[PDB]
């Protein structure tokens with residue numbers, strides 16, 4: 001079973017998932033001087049006013065908040081996308097210390113954490129079909145730096161003690177993901193992959209330029225989670241990030257000058 005440790009981490013994943021060495025893997029370093037401004041890119045449309053959160057879950061690799069994706073209630077459109085993408089879940093990647101934790105990097109800078117909002121293309125009907133398509137998913141990535149608290153994150157932080165170990169879940173209704181977004185929707189975009197197994201090459205990545213700030217207390221609570229199940233030796237859930245992968249033949253485009 002894959003993980004983030006010495007014997008089962010990112011350098012091992014290609015054995016079970018050979019696409020790990022593919023042509024469009026994620027994350028990548030975003031070299032800001034090389035990314036090209038594309039004036040043909042549209043503003044991103046984020047429509048989360050009718051979002052219906054369901055549950056919060058420790059899945060042994062991260063924690064996730066899951067949404068009702070059975071109707072067009074929380075959707076991503078525009079930007080680099082053709083068509084409509086339904087929000088399924090969000091989750092985070094973070095470090096053992098504030099100088100690492102993000103998956104994407106910016107001019108080799110690592111942020112303390114990275115938020116991923118995962119959406120799937122309604123033209124494929126369900127997420128399982130969407131991951132088999134090159135335009136199946138759109139993941140909105142948001143960097144976290146440590147400073148001032150993010151008020152809209154606190155409701156998440158306060159329930160993490162109830163999902164400490166792998167397999168635990170709780171009710172998590174009425175959570176508004178608009179409270180996790182920065183002011184600007186300026187972004188970089190490129191064609192890539194899931195950053196966890198199965199590493200499928202099905203993602204249009206949209207990475208926001210502006211980070212959100214979270215407090216040291218908020219990120220400390222992330223770091224109290226466990227990779228292990230209850231009853232097994234305690235292993236802190238920290239450093240659950242894949243490093244930057246080769247860009248190969250891809251262009252990163254910027255929505256802004």
Ligand SMILES: [N]S(=O)(=O)[C][C][C]C123[B@@]45[B@@]67[C@@]89[B@]1%10B81%11B698B746B814B562B%10%1143
Pocket residue numbers: 116118127131139193194195196197198
């Ligand atoms: N880190 S990341 O690339 O956002 C990880 C994706 C986590 C998931 B969970 B299940 C598999 B991969 B696809 B489905 B659903 B859909 B979502 B995406």
Ligand SMILES: [Zn+2]
Pocket residue numbers: 091092093116195
């Ligand atoms: Zn992720």
